Amino acid sequence: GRVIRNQRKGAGSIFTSHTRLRQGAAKLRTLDYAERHGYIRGIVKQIVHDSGRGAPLAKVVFRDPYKYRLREEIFIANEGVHTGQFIYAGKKASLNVGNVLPLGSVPEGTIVSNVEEKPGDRGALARASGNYVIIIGHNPDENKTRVRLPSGAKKVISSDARGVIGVIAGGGRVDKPLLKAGRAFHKYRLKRNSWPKTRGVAMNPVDHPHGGGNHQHIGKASTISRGAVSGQKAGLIAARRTGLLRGSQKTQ
Template identity: 25%
Template sequence: MLQPRITLRHIYSQGQAFLPALRRPYIQAADSLRPSTHSSPAAPVPTFAPQEQLQSTTAQTGLRRYKPRTPGQRHLIRPINDHLWRGRPLYKLTVAKKGQSRGGRNHTGKVVVRHRGGGAKRRIRLVDFHRWGEGAQVVERIEHDPGRTAHIALVRNLESGERSYILAADGTRAGDVVQSYRKGLPKDLTNSIGGHIDRGLVASKTAYRGNCLQLGMIPVGTPIFNISLDKNSAGTVCRSAGTYGTIVSKGQDEVQKEMVKFLEDQGRGRQGQALDISAFTHDQLAKYEKAAGYVTIRLSSGELRLFDKEAVATIGVASNALHQYAQLGKAGRSRWLGIRPTVRGVAMNACDHPHGGGRGKGKGNNHPSSPWGKPAKSGYKTRPRNKINKMVVQERPRNQGKRRKRA
């Protein structure tokens, strides 16, 4: 005789004591992750500011894994971001993303970027990369932006009440107060330090996480992100999740050292606190004046680059530093992101790709190339030789076809 089936409704009617035993947990564990040495966002912290103002929170967070109740959850790994806002964005600070550009097409309908199309419906967030607004701004919430890897913060100006989106620094939470000093130092701040602008004293009161400062006012060794190229443009460098730059040296300090050394070699000393400028030629002074207007910054790629000292940057590291360790878990999540599949060239016909056609799975006696016949490997140079970026002091390390040694 078959046993009668006990329904869940009957168990629930007897009491809720049985429900915890019937629940199946989705999350398996939260793994803590130690940042690696080559991609760690923990840059040298200046001694003028407290540790909690610039220290990254990557070591305090971790990755979340799921119990494989479905095949798509077996390899799913996500960063723990429980502090993110779960509601909708501020509607007036968004723009609808429509048109054929979502499919990688230009205004004529031709595909100019492959492997794009479909995906979830989304709105573009209008992020303020300039940071021209003055006054203190309070962070209302931290949000996820589907258009970028880093998180964004909704800030409200305490004086005008105007809201705007900015790139969130790693460790920024709701309730923090940030400020932009792009237009200069306010009068109350200069009066509080005695009217004399001392770089060390100014940095101790302004160089905090999330604040926007000119590069000439930021101390050496400070991690920065959202760096602009000149004094009027928006921040364009180091905006992805976990990226940052480090100020290596300032041209003003280096020029002063060279001028003092030159005077000592000539047998002339200082006239009090000032330098004897009469010992230098007009060309030397022009060269020193030009060099003093730049700041040397080491980017996350290892490249050393010169920036204008009047350009601005945000103190800290770009948020969501554990984004590089996330795994989607299944192909469907790539389609949700608007990423279409990538077909190998050897799987195509000969009319579609130089690697296609033939019997077997080989590409024949053809060199690796793109679908249009352009060499793809073997150190093929694509940048013109006569266009050299003079602002690059040292290029980023390249593998040149060899595996890079781990530190």
């Protein structure tokens, strides 16, 4: 009879992200004439920690081509990028780690990061620590690039979409056990109010579909239809299968 927790999250009162300490949105440069036709050289001034983000950010300063001033950009630092390094962004930039190139300007097998889903969105794909996108092919006519995403999905993107050569820094982060409720607490204190999590079976029927009973148990299948409604989508939503995953991925 009560609005369940996953329903309450959408109102965004206490479930908003804790963004106070964050350095700013990590984005590529705005796609401009210099990047569309040649390249522009920036300088990596600082490699800094972003609160709530595993990957470090790189503050990169470019000259403004149209006004005498500097423009600071917040890239997601690729591993091996250092302070004082010159970053080259544009169609004519070299195939060096940290450079920002259009997807169509790199050969097959290139490893890129912070890849734009569309040209000029300034980076959407392979942004988390240790992640990267692989260029697996080009279709020059109707200019598109086929890429492999961290999840293993194959995606077709415009060849004018940009990416940073290399892998996002900070990889291996999840290999260390948190070892402590307090460490999970401090992790999520800087992300959002999603921790700790009460099990639905530990609640009452009013609070959750899984609540109630003289034993803790789901009672009905935890696999929930894709067409179910809000307040019903607790458990395994639209699960194709359940159980300990035995077998191969990358289905043909």
